Paper text:
The genome is replicated via a negative-sense RNA intermediate by 3Dpol, the viral RNA-dependent RNA polymerase (RdRP). For this, 3Dpol uses the viral protein 3B, in this context usually termed VPg (viral protein genome-linked), as a primer. Crystal structures have been reported of 3Dpol of the enteroviruses CVB3, PV, EV71, HRV1B, HRV14, and HRV16, and of the aphthovirus FMDV. These enzymes adopt a classical right hand architecture, with fingers, palm and thumb subdomains providing the correct geometrical arrangement of substrate molecules and metal ions at the polymerase active site for catalysis. Given its critical role in genome replication, 3Dpol is regarded as an attractive target for antiviral drugs.
These mutations were located either at nucleotide 7115 (A7115G) or 7127 (A7127G) resulting in amino acid changes M300V and I304V in the viral RdRP, 3Dpol, respectively. Markedly higher inhibition constants were observed for the two resistant mutants (M300V, 26.9 μM; I304V, 10.3 μM) as compared to that for the wt enzyme (1.3 μM). The 3Dpol I304V mutant crystallized in the space group C2 with six polymerase molecules per a.u. and diffracted to 3.2 Å resolution. Structural comparisons showed that the mutant polymerases were almost identical to the wt enzyme. The main differences were concentrated in helix α10, which contains the mutated residues, and in the preceding loop B. The side chains of residues 300 and 304 participate in a large hydrophobic cluster linking α10 with helices α2 (Y75), α6 (F194, A195, F199), α7 (I210) and α8 (L241, F255 and F256), included in the inner fingers. The substitutions of the methionine and isoleucine side chains by the shorter valine in the mutants imply a weakening of these hydrophobic interactions. This could result in an increased flexibility of α10, including the disruption of the last helical turn, and of the B-loop, which appears to have a key role in GPC-N114 binding in EMCV 3Dpol. In contrast, I304 seems to be located relatively far away of the GPC-N114 binding cavity.
Author numbering: 1 to 460
């Protein structure tokens, strides 16, 4: 919200060509999907894609009800009771290498401005052996330690991916925000030690599916939500952008605070996300509110806010409502409510509408069903398919066809390998149907029994 125009500067090229190309299986399945619109002169749409991206960000909420604060600090108590309040700053060595049971920073990811303009990669700007930034990058990280984030400009561009034909026709393409590499390092310094603990324990108590593995953890999520009377599926609309600047303050003061064992600089880092400066072609602008993408923190941040927001809506809608009445499971804006009560999310939608957040039923029709169970819900594009004492992540049939219909030249073998581990849960008949197009044109893929056996090996 609140997009303020700044003085224009050097041209930072937004890419306007898809790398996606159709496979041999596109003609077979013909999914309701196509590459996202990137150019203004894309003939598949009437609309200007830059206008549609800039039409969003109207204005976030200035204020926010007082119930958001108490439910935030009450959620904080539960989280830090389990994980602990030893969430101090990590060294630059620890940030790059990552802690034990935490992936190291990706060397391939974009380094951000001005390194992308100069044609440099992440491994140019730092030495991973010694954890040593080059003089230019080192002094910028120094200034951010001294409470100054004035140099930080997000490289912003359109997301190259598949979209529904309606999103392609309407030119509604998602926006990627790439922060500078030093900003991304500093983020993992301040919030890394906490993130490592949050990743390792996904479940209903922490209220998060972050750092899970659908093959294994679906059985754990399944059995945990099994005993409950109902399970609701709730989806937000523009969850990242609708975060108010007040929400960021709440997190800094109540959740990611020095009381809970965080670095004092965390507050200033969170303000860099709250009020951020972006570069798009020659345009420069300033968005007040909403969480930018980029780096590993984004999914965790939304997961924390999601547990707060959904309960705050319930507190507002349902009087004498309890915190433990609802058990939550979420991976960012993908939300899953488990409860013994009977909740009406039509009235919760109207409550949260006033607070800025917009929920939807996730079933293409404006009616949250009063009755809903574990078998009905869809979480992470997957369903909960019980099989003996286990649960299998059965992925949507229309999703699987869409994934196989397009690809990026060069990395086709890597793609097919990963999709076999998804399609295995749909059954041998469905499995061999989905890969038949590729085998038809002389492309070998592993047997169903090979990959099905591999999945069963996880539980031995």
């Amino acid at each position: 919200g609140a997009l303020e125009r700044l003085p224009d500067g050097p041209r930072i090229h937004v890419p306007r060509k898809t790398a996606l190309r159709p496979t041999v299986a596109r003609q077979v399945f013909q999914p309701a999907f196509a590459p996202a619109v990137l150019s203004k002169f894309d003939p598949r749409t009437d609309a200007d894609v830059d206008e549609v991206a800039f039409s969003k960000h109207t204005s976030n909420q200035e204020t926010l009800p007082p119930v958001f604060r108490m439910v935030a600090r009450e959620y904080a108590n539960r989280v830090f009771a389990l994980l602990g309040r030893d969430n101090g700053r990590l060294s630059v060595k620890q940030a790059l290498d990552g802690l034990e049971g935490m992936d190291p920073m990706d060397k391939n990811t974009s380094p951000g401005l001005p390194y992308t303009t100069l044609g440099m990669r992440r491994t140019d700007v730092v030495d991973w052996e010694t954890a040593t930034l080059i003089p230019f990058a080192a002094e910028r990280l120094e200034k951010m330690n001294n409470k100054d984030f004035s140099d930080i400009v997000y490289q912003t561009f359109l997301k190259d991916e598949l979209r529904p034909i309606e999103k392609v026709q309407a030119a509604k393409t998602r926006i990627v925000d790439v922060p500078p590499f030093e900003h991304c390092i500093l983020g993992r310094q301040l919030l890394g030690k906490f993130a490592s603990k949050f990743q390792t324990q996904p479940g209903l108590e922490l209220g998060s599916a972050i750092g899970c593995d659908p093959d294994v953890h679906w059985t754990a999520f399944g059995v945990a939500m099994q005993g409950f009377e109902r399970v609701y599926d709730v989806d937000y609309s523009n969850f990242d952008s609708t975060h108010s600047v007040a929400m960021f303050r709440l997190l800094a003061e109540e959740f990611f605070s020095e009381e809970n064992g965080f670095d004092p600089l965390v507050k200033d880092y969170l303000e860099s996300l709250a009020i951020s400066k972006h570069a798009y072609e020659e345009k420069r602008y300033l968005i007040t509110g909403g969480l930018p993408s980029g780096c590993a923190a984004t999914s965790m941040l939304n997961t924390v806010m999601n547990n707060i927001i959904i309960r705050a809506g319930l507190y507002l809608t349902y009087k004498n409502f309890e915190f433990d009445d609802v058990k939550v499971l979420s991976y960012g804006d993908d939300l899953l409510v488990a409860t013994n009560y009977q909740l009406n999310f039509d009235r919760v939608r109207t409550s949260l509408a006033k607070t800025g957040y917009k929920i939807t039923p996730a079933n293409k029709t404006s009616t949250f069903p009063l009755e809903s169970t574990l078998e009905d819900v869809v979480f992470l594009k997957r369903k909960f398919k019980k099989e003996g004492p286990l649960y299998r992540p059965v992925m949507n049939r229309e999703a699987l066809e869409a994934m196989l219909s397009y690809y990026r030249p060069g990395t086709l073998s890597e793609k097919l390998t990963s999709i076999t581990m998804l399609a295995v849960h749909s059954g041998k008949q469905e499995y061999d149907r989905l890969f038949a197009p590729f085998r038809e044109v002389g492309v070998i893929v592993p047997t169903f029994e090979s990959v099905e056996y591999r999945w069963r090996s996880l539980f031995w």
